Amino acid sequence: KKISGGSVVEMQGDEMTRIIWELIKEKLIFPYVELDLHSYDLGIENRDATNDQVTKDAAEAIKKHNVGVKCATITPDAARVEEFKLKQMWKSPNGTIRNILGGTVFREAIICKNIPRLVSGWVKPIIIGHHAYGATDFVVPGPEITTYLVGGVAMGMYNQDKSIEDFAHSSFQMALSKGWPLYLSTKKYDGRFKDIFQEIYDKQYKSQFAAAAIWYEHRLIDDMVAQAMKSEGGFIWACKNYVAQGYGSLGMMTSVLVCPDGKTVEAEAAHGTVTRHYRMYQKGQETSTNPIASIFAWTRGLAHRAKLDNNKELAFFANALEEVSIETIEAGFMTKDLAACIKGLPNVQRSDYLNTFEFMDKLGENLKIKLAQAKL
Amino acid sequence: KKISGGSVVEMQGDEMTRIIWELIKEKLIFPYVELDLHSYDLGIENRDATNDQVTKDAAEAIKKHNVGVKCATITPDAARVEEFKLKQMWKSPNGTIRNILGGTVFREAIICKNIPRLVSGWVKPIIIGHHAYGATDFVVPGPEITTYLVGGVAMGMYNQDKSIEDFAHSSFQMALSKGWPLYLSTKKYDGRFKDIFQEIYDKQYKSQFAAAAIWYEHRLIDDMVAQAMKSEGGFIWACKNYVAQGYGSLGMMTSVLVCPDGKTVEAEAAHGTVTRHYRMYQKGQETSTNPIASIFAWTRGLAHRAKLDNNKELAFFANALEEVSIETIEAGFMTKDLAACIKGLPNVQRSDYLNTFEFMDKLGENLKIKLAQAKL
């Protein structure tokens, strides 16, 4: 009999990540877990038909059930307005959900031994989160802020303390959850971030970090980058300042929005819908899309659900699926992007990787085997 | 007979870098070059005695003679106010000179084959410059900028176009001088930097870069860092945003303030006075201070002087001194910081490095040999 999963808020996406989403739901989750799934179709067509209301409804559902799992959606531009005949250029769903829930988005890459990383010395995962908004910029033609005194360009921003307290609480809750030490990086206004972090830490998180064998320290980003390059990793990085690019493969990058209460979490893939692979999929050409980010979104969601419900079966299942993914990649079975991470894209042959459906089938067989091995 | 050097503005410093400054002047420069040296003693005692006027006078002298060579000075704090009984906590001389002259400071590390760098893939020098100021920050107790609308913390900044044009001109003049491609990194207000750089480039620097076999491109800093880590180097990096730390040894780091006109240049060591080594020097203990940054400040100053005067002898001499330094370090003779860069500080023995005066004597012998080898 399947595990009793619980209440999970599902958010369906677009294009290739939508295909991968249904594949993961049918091959890795539903055959073994029975969920109270609150499905919200965040497709661009459904978003346009409901005037982007389904995104608000889904965010409220995450606020109610404390667990959300999101697929990659389309942030529309003008070309997207033409492609789907949209009634408007809708806002980013991630920004709407992040604004309704609050908290902080944390990104982490999945580590495999045979997949080279940006720095060889890195051994343990490095989780990175940034302070979101939730600032006025105008141009001065020719020759104050209230009252202080400030052609060219003038911009003035205001940041409430509530956002600093939410960022601090989210960082501390994340560090307590993962069990890694927390480091804050900054660069007069920045003098308040350090004092608020230190006060909330000393008053509400000192004995918790001490019991968790972790700690919190403050750094300058100039020191944080250099020290991070010459370290083994294994830490949470709260970055200040005011997607990704080329720091590894995007199929291994995962994202988790964490609310300051420490109970509401949204997991999703850090990459996008992977549009090019979807264009090759529509014409019927062979694709090789990496499903690790979405799978780990599901396993992070089920993991936090198990933590909230104290469901040991669900936690063991999510951890088991993560282990199946990492072990499958380490055994030599991977998509084309990882083989390109190993041998380099020019030297990549067809025998060096599996396509999308072959890799999903491999993960299905290996997950079935590992779950069958749990016979005590 | 000595070379006719020309007019050079000298700025004497403090403590260990002052000792090294006199050593370099007596061992590597004066025996071979006859300079119209406009010496300005920027010592903390002389700065305090003249109410920091000697810094202004020196900066004006650099503005007149287009060439400046500066030693490391002391930026005083409270402890420095007590140490020298200062009449005031004087401002940074580098900021005063940089404000009087304008331009942009560019930092570059000296490369040696046996001295490991932060990334193994780096082969060619990476020069990095930032946009200086030359912004109001206040606290809001409880519940606009003119007129646009903006407890907490509020800050408002204003940046004229003249600073953007000076930063652009200085970056283009630097890229033309060194012969490396220029890359600008940014992150609404930032939309003007790109347009000003592109306009000044297309109207005043296109055929110059084309003739110099270089080019200019715009990047996002998120892409600039990742792409820079997976490149061989050899470029100028104009960084926007709004000393060093641990990106190598500070004894190999050099700084050059470049005015937008492309004719006025100030060279100095990127590191500070190295106070600890001076404390070991006062007690009579053996020290091992790296003189490469100050030597390369002198050779950069003499190099720009030779370029302004079309003095081929002076340029050949400065380049010869740089070659003597790099070749001497590559031959196995170095200070303790470089030996620590090789074998690691715990595994560093006394036989792995030379002290300060031994290294200066070695550079004297090798420079004498190379200059004697120039017998055609």
Ligand SMILES: *OP(=O)(O)O[C@@H]1[C@H](O)[C@@H](COP(=O)(O)OP(=O)(O)OC[C@H]2O[C@@H](N3C=CCC(C(N)=O)=C3)[C@H](O)[C@@H]2O)O[C@H]1n1cnc2c(N)ncnc21
């Ligand atoms: O072919 P190759 O592997 O070189 O290139 C692929 C892929 O094309 C590229 C990035 O694709 P991407 O979807 O990550 O980003 P992009 O296509 O520019 O944006 C497309 C689409 O995604 C929406 N986003 C963006 C970010 C997150 C997000 C969300 N809702 O959470 C939505 C944008 O709005 C836009 O409409 O890199 C290669 N790539 C990326 N990921 C890959 C995987 N998993 N497997 C293989 N290659 C992958």
Ligand SMILES: *OP(=O)(O)O[C@@H]1[C@H](O)[C@@H](COP(=O)(O)OP(=O)(O)OC[C@H]2O[C@@H](N3C=CCC(C(N)=O)=C3)[C@H](O)[C@@H]2O)O[C@H]1n1cnc2c(N)ncnc21
């Ligand atoms: O002993 P070890 O090699 O580990 O440490 C030395 C040195 O102590 C340390 C940095 O010394 P520093 O002078 O670079 O920076 P610091 O001592 O913190 O500041 C001292 C003094 O310098 C003035 N500055 C600062 C920056 C530039 C500057 C200027 N006017 O241009 C002035 C400050 O105001 C302050 O009063 O790192 C090691 N180190 C640095 N440089 C070394 C060399 N050349 N050789 C060997 N070790 C060196």
Ligand SMILES: O=C(O)C[C@H]1CCN(c2ccc(C(=O)N[C@@H]3[C@@H]4C[C@@H]5C[C@H]3C[C@@](O)(C5)C4)c(SC3CCCCC3)n2)C1
């Ligand atoms: O030539 C050498 O071998 C030594 C040089 C090479 C690199 N270097 C410095 C010297 C100084 C710096 C440096 O100051 N980095 C800062 C920049 C870039 C980012 C990190 C820091 C804060 C920030 O706000 C963002 C501004 C750097 S940044 C480095 C570039 C390469 C990729 C990682 C980030 N690099 C000194």
Ligand SMILES: O=C(O)C[C@H]1CCN(c2ccc(C(=O)N[C@@H]3[C@@H]4C[C@@H]5C[C@H]3C[C@@](O)(C5)C4)c(SC3CCCCC3)n2)C1
């Ligand atoms: O776990 C892995 O193997 C993949 C992770 C590890 C590193 N990583 C990312 C993923 C994303 C980023 C990243 O977004 N870097 C930006 C930060 C830090 C600085 C560079 C960029 C602009 C900036 O303003 C300054 C803000 C980074 S920064 C990197 C950290 C390590 C030293 C060099 C600079 N790193 C993805």
